[model samples]
Target: DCVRFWGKCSQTSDCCPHLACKSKWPRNICVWDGSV
Candidate 1:
């Protein structure tokens, strides 16, 4: 399932479109995949 904004994730594939894994392991979460 696609992850939502600020949702917990383990990889870039874990998040929905336009979202990526931010932070680090354990605390990894899905944030904007746009400009950093």
Candidate 2:
């Protein structure tokens, strides 16, 4: 469950290996695949 809306922010630290936030929906798809 990733979250951090309002203009956008939570890049989770700039996903290098993995870490992305700021999405209420519409990311095309590919939520790390597993259980959020």
Candidate 3:
């Protein structure tokens, strides 16, 4: 499987359907995005 929720990701595949490619933190991390 891919990454989600605080997992490091090259792409948010098999992970969040949300756009968690870098987040506001920009650590190349995948997590929740409440902004849409």
Better by TM-score, candidate 3 or 1:
1
Which regions in candidate 3 have their CA more than 4 angstroms from the true location?
12-14, 24-26
Please give, for residues 1-36, the per-residue lDDT of candidate 1 as tens digits: 888768888775787877877854447788766574
Ranking by TM-score: 1, 3, 2
Candidate 1 or 2, higher lDDT? 1
lDDT of each: 0.75, 0.36, 0.63
Pairs of residues at least 3 apart in sequence or in different chains that clash in candidate 3: none
Model 3: number of backbone collisions: 0
Candidate 1 error regions (>4 Å): 24-26
| Per-residue alpha-carbon lDDT of candidate 3 for residues 1-36, written as tens digits (9 for 90 to 100) | 656567666663645676466655757677766674
| Residue-level error in angstroms, candidate 1, position 33 | 2.5
- What tens digits encode model 2's per-residue C-alpha lDDT throughout 1-36? 432233233444432334344344754222332343
Best TM-score goes to which candidate?
1
Which prediction has more favorable lDDT, 2 or 3? Answer: 3
Deviation in angstroms for 32 in model 1? 2.0
